[PDB]
């Protein structure tokens, strides 16, 4: 895993996503989800997920988070106060600590100023505390910006390494990334219940006569709903009217 | 009402309105428009013993959440897979408890 | 962690066999119970494993209806009992520590801990 | 599934590298390929899981790696109490699963 300061991402689309395999798994130790509830994850469509993953040390679990603040939140790893995604944490001690300490992983001590949302910060500048340039020289009032854990198996367990991995769901366009659901057969010229790539309602489906365009998936009313779908099997456009 | 139990010390945070994880989830409830208080405090020297106290369990696995003061006392092999268990506790079914 | 098994038994054909492992320093419950035979001169067989928190058990074919797993939580203590025993039944018996199979990283696969066997002459 | 490693026995001197060989008669997933190191008169003990990951307390000295039907396992260089009897084991179908081990 990566240290938090230089955390890696990897970009998930174009598949079906299980989350119920790891949301009902014993273990991990946090399964926090802002934005969306963890037991509908499944019924969902997104166009891109992010998976991003680093090792904090158990104290500063509770820094990942939206509105939070610390070291971490500000110099290291930033969230938006409007995230949609789920972070997920579990102890590491096994793997990441040894007799001696580890020190692979560090984090960023100071900075200028904070981070923006999912900025990532990996240089090694000089920082200066006060008001004499320090010129690429390390000493009074001039530190090296990052800092060591030094995980060790018989830290306590807020000072035992963990290993987060955060899931960041961009809901836009055509969904790539949705759950396993099971699709039914198309029911048209009656009132029926109907879910298209996550899009959900009531009304009646008919053959459209609209011309739509080989890359537009859907049409819009002036109240902000939508009155026709392409299916994602056939291609076939419907027009979806209320019923009555 | 006075609804006692035992858990230990990190999960005395999801005793309340508004709470996720395994305690929160799958074995006790509680609703947002909660009235009433939670009180507790340490008996380590009552409920642990030299070698471990085993008496003491709760759920790890169920198929959905709890509902507001609902109790489930059922030991019913857990389906983690979609190949049914029939009562057989092996790969992708689980003890419920822990 | 640590697995103490009893001491050297010998058996004549037709009798039983009851081999205890104490187990400690970890969480009983949270792991299965395996245990694993070694005859003299050959590799290793593994017979079944005892899960603590329910009681429930698996056996390898080859000692179906022949050997039965029970534990005892109260003394972190697990029991094997091999019946109908023959002299090709000689061999020092081993127990394991072993992941159960919710295991998110796939900890049921491979035995982390071993006990000192005990060796069983029939 | 069988598992068959090889060669039988093998003999080098210390502070050089040996290398042993496990194959199975069927693909085994690189999770469920694990490997034990056997001294005389001791109870076998885990060097390898995962077909690479290291065992808590074994020297950086081992390594494994593989996929499908062939695995290895590597000692980088030997020392007087690696010359013991290693084991490769497989978990598939709801069993465990031993090779016949090979003398080092």
């Known amino acids: 895993f990566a240290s938090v300061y230089a955390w890696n991402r990897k970009r998930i689309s174009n598949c079906v996503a299980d989350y119920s395999v790891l949301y009902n798994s014993a273990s991990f130790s946090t399964f926090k989800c802002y934005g969306v509830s963890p037991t509908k994850l499944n019924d969902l469509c997104f166009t891109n997920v992010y998976a991003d993953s680093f090792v904090i040390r158990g104290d500063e679990v509770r820094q990942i988070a939206p509105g939070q603040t610390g070291k971490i939140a500000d110099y290291n790893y930033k969230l938006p106060d409007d995230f949609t995604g789920c972070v997920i944490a579990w102890n590491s001690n096994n793997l990441d600590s040894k007799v001696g300490g580890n020190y692979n992983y560090r984090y960023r001590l100071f900075r200028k100023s904070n981070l923006k949302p999912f900025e990532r910060d990996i240089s090694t500048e000089i920082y200066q505390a006060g008001s004499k340039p320090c010129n690429g020289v390390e000493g009074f009032n001039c530190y090296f910006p990052l800092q060591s854990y030094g995980f060790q198996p018989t830290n306590g367990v807020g000072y035992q390494p963990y290993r987060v991995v955060v899931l960041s769901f961009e809901l836009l366009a055509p969904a790539t990334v949705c759950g396993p659901k099971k699709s039914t057969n198309l029911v048209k010229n009656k009132c029926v219940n109907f879910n298209f790539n996550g899009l959900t309602g009531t009304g009646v489906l008919t053959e459209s006569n609209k011309k739509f365009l080989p890359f537009q998936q859907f049409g819009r009313d002036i109240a902000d709903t939508t009155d026709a779908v392409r299916d994602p099997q056939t291609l076939e456009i419907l027009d979806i009217t209320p019923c009555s | 009402y006075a609804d006692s139990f035992v858990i230990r010390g990190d999960e005395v945070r999801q005793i309340a309105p508004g709470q996720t994880g395994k305690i929160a989830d799958y074995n006790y409830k509680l609703p947002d428009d909660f009235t009433g208080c939670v009180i507790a405090w340490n008996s380590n020297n009552l409920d642990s013993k030299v070698g471990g106290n085993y008496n003491y369990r709760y759920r790890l696995f169920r198929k959905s959440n709890l509902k507001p003061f609902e109790r489930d006392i059922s030991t019913e092999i857990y389906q983690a897979g979609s190949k049914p268990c029939n009562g057989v506790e092996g790969f992708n079914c689980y003890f419920p408890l822990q | 962690v640590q697995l103490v098994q009893s001491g050297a038994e010998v058996k004549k054909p037709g009798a039983s066999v009851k081999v205890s492992c104490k187990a400690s320093?970890?969480?009983?419950?949270?792991?299965?119970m395996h245990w694993v035979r070694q005859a003299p001169g050959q590799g290793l067989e593994w017979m079944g494993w005892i899960n603590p928190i329910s009681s429930g058990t698996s056996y390898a074919q080859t000692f179906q209806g022949r050997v039965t797993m029970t534990s005892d939580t109260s003394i972190t203590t697990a029991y094997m009992e091999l019946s109908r025993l023959r002299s090709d039944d000689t061999a020092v018996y081993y127990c394991?520590?072993?992941?159960?199979?919710?295991?998110?990283?796939?900890?049921?696969?491979?035995?982390?801990?071993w006990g000192q066997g005990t060796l069983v002459t029939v | 599934i069988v598992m068959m490693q090889s060669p039988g026995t093998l003999s080098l001197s210390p502070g050089e590298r040996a290398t042993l060989s496990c194959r199975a008669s069927q693909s085994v997933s690189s999770s469920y390929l694990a490997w034990y190191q056997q001294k005389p008169g001791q109870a076998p003990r885990l060097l390898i899981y995962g077909a690479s990951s290291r065992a808590t307390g074994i020297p950086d000295r081992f390594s494994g790696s593989g996929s499908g039907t062939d695995f290895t396992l590597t000692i980088s260089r030997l020392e007087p109490e690696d010359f013991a009897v290693y084991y490769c084991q497989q978990y598939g179908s709801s069993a465990w699963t031993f090779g016949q081990g090979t003398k080092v």
């Open positions: 320093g970890y969480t009983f419950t949270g792991y299965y």
């Open positions: 394991a520590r072993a992941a159960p199979f919710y295991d998110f990283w796939s900890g049921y696969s491979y035995f982390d801990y």
